[PDB]
Structure 1
Amino acid sequence: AWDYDNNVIRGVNLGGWFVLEPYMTPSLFEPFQNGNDQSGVPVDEYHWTQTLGKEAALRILQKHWSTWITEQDFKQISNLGLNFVRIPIGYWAFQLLDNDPYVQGQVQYLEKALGWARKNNIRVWIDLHGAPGSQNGFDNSGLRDSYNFQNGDNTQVTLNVLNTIFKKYGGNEYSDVVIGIELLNEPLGPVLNMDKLKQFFLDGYNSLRQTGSVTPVIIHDAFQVFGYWNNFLTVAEGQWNVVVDHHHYQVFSGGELSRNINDHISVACNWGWDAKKESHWNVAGEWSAALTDCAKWLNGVNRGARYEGAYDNAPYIGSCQPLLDISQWSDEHKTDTRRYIEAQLDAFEYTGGWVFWSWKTENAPEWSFQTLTYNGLFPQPVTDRQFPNQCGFH
């Protein structure tokens, strides 16, 4: 349903939909704030659902699931020239651990979304974004600050969930829509046993193929250096239809944030040069326009921004207040953003393509494809360049 050699992915993530992220939909978390005190705000979907209880969580989530993304968004995605969406989903949509607080019902909307994709000629990756015990301790896995995916039977439960995803979405029914099943979003390589992670990836690969599926297996790079996965799941070993998903951002450390705009662009270009050298098809599955970590709660509930020296011992660069609203951005910040977007687009189109994180946010402009497009900062059409050939690719 896709030619990874000849086609280029031009997509957006449908984040914040089936896995709640506080910075993307702060309105679902803000009611727990007491004045200026954020100490009682649930920090992730696990705690948000636990605090609300099953009945209220389901009522509120049904409303969210039914309105956050609808068929109209798919039409808009298509109309903007995009051809792909990545859909993050947590394990709890298919299976609950004993005592899990999560509620289910996401599958119904996922299936609606696959039909909306089909109708608008959009291809999809289904991405298992959160695994039992958490594979990275990020709030986007469902459970912040826990790293127990390789503990107990958590890996086996994840494989059982993947088997359900493989049987439902890796077969003939969605073969015209689903062009990749991503086994696990952002396993945090540095804190995990890499040998066991590779075994898990191999087990998922084999299990999928064993079902008769020919669907591409997407493996996230686990934050490893470029080329790390070159000798894994290779055609020489009869392993095929494998894609490496690289996520690229330059805002999650003081060092990255302090780069001037030219250096930010040089790093973006270098991502293109280095991805070209890899032996597997590869797609920039996540990236954004952000040059700051200012979006409220981006680093997590009750955590400030490194950009204004309020987190991770980073030095103050600038005030975030002025950057929270796109109408308050200076002409220079708008220009820098446009340059940054275009350099990333060129670098990612140099290989398999790109998937912006994310389609929409409630009020975080750097992370919203819609907002940037409407304010003229994201090229439209997407091939438009105000700053042509910043990288000089050959």
Structure 2
Amino acid sequence: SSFDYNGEKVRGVNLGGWLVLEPWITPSIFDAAGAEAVDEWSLTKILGKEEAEARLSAHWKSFVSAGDFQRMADAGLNHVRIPIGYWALGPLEGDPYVDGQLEYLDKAVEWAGAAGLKVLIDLHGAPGSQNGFDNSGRRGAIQWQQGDTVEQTLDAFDLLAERYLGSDTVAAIEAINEPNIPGGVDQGKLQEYYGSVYGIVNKYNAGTSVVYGDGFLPVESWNGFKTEGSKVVMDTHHYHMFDNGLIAMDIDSHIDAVCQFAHQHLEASDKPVIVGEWTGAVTDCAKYLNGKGNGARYDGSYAADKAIGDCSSLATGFVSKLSDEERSDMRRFIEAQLDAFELKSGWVFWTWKTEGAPGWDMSDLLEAGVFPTSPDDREFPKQCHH
């Protein structure tokens, strides 16, 4: 009942890199700490607790203001998805992580409310790492579900729910970002964690929707699990640069793949489905996207046999430096995604703000006239239909 996921379209952005730092979103912060600083875990460990609190709190305070939220509303959005790590609820004994993020999430909920936006809180990192990505807090291993990690996840989730779910601004809360089933996360144990998260949400505020990631399975494979109308929302992430088939496509083929995704997957789900992450980029050229120290599929330097093209132009900077045809093709890709993802329950762009990652930065694309500001703001014919 906070938001009608069944009947109204989500139009959102992510605050990636804010309360869970990521090297590609703020490379300057990781590069200032040297070559071993490759994720939030290693960054805080290298700085130590005092200096980590100093540097990360300067970022938490400067990266987001009420003005960000006002600009999001002025762009036609109704949602903001906010990643937070388990360590924001108190680092475990021995973790290098610092806390303090809750003070800033508290401001976001107030600022979102003032701007007329809903907040979707996203538990983006779990003890042991649910995916092995740097964006979980610690790259290189999937240890979530070993030891007491799941109980520790539920302890953190419970504190987070207590603090926030009583606000009607917090319309929805996500169990865990990108639990990596193909990477070894056990689906049966994930479903048990999902059931416990639902129980937590309904202890405090039945009006708040529960959001479940598809775990990289087809989102329609979750049919028959917690099917409850507006109450339970699936979150699928749609990207064209992490797959060696999609990354080889031309712009027309990219647009075809987006419509095919909406028809085969979004329209096949028995629940509301948000595309809770997607972007304007069609390459993996952004500096450190595959991890600090790692290259790109697109130029043959990461997980690849051959270069498709060169990453010099798309690694860094802002879209004003590209050609008119490059900006035009990026907008065609974005409009196709807006229209395809609104066939089902809507969308949440990744991400609001970067240090310059062409096609990834909504605040950049909006100002450049690349990102549409309403469903009627279209420069190209509608590319996907019912």
Could you state the TM-score of these two structures normalised by the residue count of structure 2?
0.95
C-alpha deviation, 1:308, in angstroms? 0.7
C-alpha deviation, 1:208, in angstroms? 2.2
Picking from 173, 177, 180, the partner of 1:181 is 173
Picking from 177, 199, 218, the partner of 1:206 is 199
Preserved CA contact (<8 Å) 1:11 1:85: yes
For residues 316-339 of structure 1, what are the alpha-carbon distances to aligned partners after superposition, in whole Å with 9 as ceiling and x for unaligned?
Answer: 011111223424423332222111
SS in 1 for 2:221: coil
Name the residue aligned to 2:235.
245
| Paired amino acid for 2:254 | H
Picking from 104, 126, 144, the partner of 1:109 is 104
SS in 2 for 1:227: helix
C-alpha deviation, 1:258, in angstroms? 0.2
Name the residue aligned to 2:350.
357
Preserved CA contact (<8 Å) 1:88 1:127: yes
1-side partners of 2:6 and 2:187: how far apart? 29
SS in 2 for 1:285: strand
1:167 aligns with 2:158: no
Picking from 323, 337, 340, the partner of 1:347 is 340
Deviates more, 1:324-333 or 1:181-190: 324-333
Unaligned runs of 5+ in 1: 34-39
Name the residue aligned to 1:53.
48
1:4 aligns with 2:5: yes
1:24 aligns with 2:16: no
SS in 2 for 1:311: coil
Name the residue aligned to 1:289.
280
Name the residue aligned to 1:220.
213
C-alpha deviation, 1:209, in angstroms? 1.6
Preserved CA contact (<8 Å) 1:234 1:240: no
2-side partners of 1:82 and 1:211: how far apart? 27
Alignment of 1:238-317 (within 5 A): 241-273=231-263, 274-317=265-308
| Paired amino acid for 1:14 | L
1-side partners of 2:42 and 2:96: how far apart? 8
Identity %: 46
| Paired amino acid for 1:264 | H
User: 1:390 and 1:3, CA in 2 relative to 1: closer, same or farther beyond 3 A?
Assistant: same
User: 1:99 and 1:265, CA in 2 relative to 1: closer, same or farther beyond 3 A?
Assistant: same
2-side partners of 1:187 and 1:258: how far apart? 26
1-side partners of 2:307 and 2:4: how far apart? 45
Superposition misfits of 4+ residues, deviation over 4 angstroms: none
C-alpha deviation, 1:380, in angstroms? 3.0
| Paired amino acid for 2:11 | R
Name the residue aligned to 1:63.
58
Name the residue aligned to 2:359.
366
C-alpha deviation, 1:213, in angstroms? 3.2
2-side partners of 1:81 and 1:275: how far apart? 22
1-side partners of 2:383 and 2:26: how far apart? 34
Deviates more, 1:289-298 or 1:239-248: 239-248
| Paired amino acid for 1:285 | G
C-alpha deviation, 1:342, in angstroms? 0.6
2-side partners of 1:220 and 1:180: how far apart? 13
C-alpha deviation, 1:240, in angstroms? 7.0
2-side partners of 1:184 and 1:199: how far apart? 13
2-side partners of 1:370 and 1:85: how far apart? 13
1-side partners of 2:320 and 2:74: how far apart? 25
2-side partners of 1:133 and 1:48: how far apart? 17
User: 1:240 and 1:285, CA in 2 relative to 1: closer, same or farther beyond 3 A?
Assistant: closer
1-side partners of 2:15 and 2:27: how far apart? 16
RMSD value, Cα: 1.4
Picking from 69, 78, 88, the partner of 1:83 is 78
